[PDB]
DNA sequence: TTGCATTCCTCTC
DNA sequence: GAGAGGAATGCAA
């Protein structure tokens, strides 16, 4: 589903299409309405050839955000317990 | 526990 | 109403 090749081009898309600000929507000269994940999905097909839904992309963007949000706090908790012990014991 | 999908929300048009 | 991104849920493994 997120095979190394599809994953590669997805990582490529992330570098190609920078993250959006508050404005999430843009119109082409023909009037078709565009989002970042839609472009990302589009770029996948361009390089991979495979089909990845606009929503499949959004799901992936989410889980990567989840992970990094964990890895940072799991570090802020792995030491918060070591700090708590030394303090609770120093009492 | 979490990587997937799927709904819910709120924006532009 | 159409269609979008992103947060909320839903859901096996």
Q: How far apart are alpha carbons A71 and A42 in whole angstroms? A: 30
Protein chain A, residues 51-70, with a C-beta closer than 7 Å to any atom of nucleic acid strand C? 54-55, 58-59, 61-62, 65
Measure A67 CA to C8 C1' (Å): 17
DSSP per-residue letters across A5-19: HHHHHHHHHHHHSPP
Report, in ranges, which bases of strand C sit under 7 Å from a protein C-beta. 3-9
Question: What resolution in angstrom units was achieved for this structure?
Answer: 2.7
3-state class of A50 per DSSP? coil
DSSP per-residue letters across A18-77: PPP-S---EE-TT--EE-HHHHHHHHHHHHT-----HHHHHHHHHHHHHHHHHHTHHHHH
Report, in ranges, which bases of strand B sit under 7 Å from a protein C-beta. 2-7, 11-13
Q: How far apart are alpha carbons A67 and A54 in whole angstroms? A: 21
**Taking a C-beta distance cutoff of 8 angstroms, is the pair A34, A25 a contact?**
yes
């Amino acid at each position: 589903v997120w095979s190394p090749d599809i994953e590669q081009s997805f990582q490529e898309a992330l570098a190609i299409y920078p993250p959006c600000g508050r404005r999430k929507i843009i119109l082409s000269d023909e009037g078709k309405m565009y989002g970042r994940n839609e472009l990302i999905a589009r770029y996948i097909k361009l390089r991979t050839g495979k089909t990845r839904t606009r929503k499949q992309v959004s799901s992936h963007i989410q889980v990567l955000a989840r992970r990094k949000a964990r890895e940072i706090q799991a570090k802020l908790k792995d030491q918060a317990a070591k700090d708590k012990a030394l303090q609770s014991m120093a009492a």
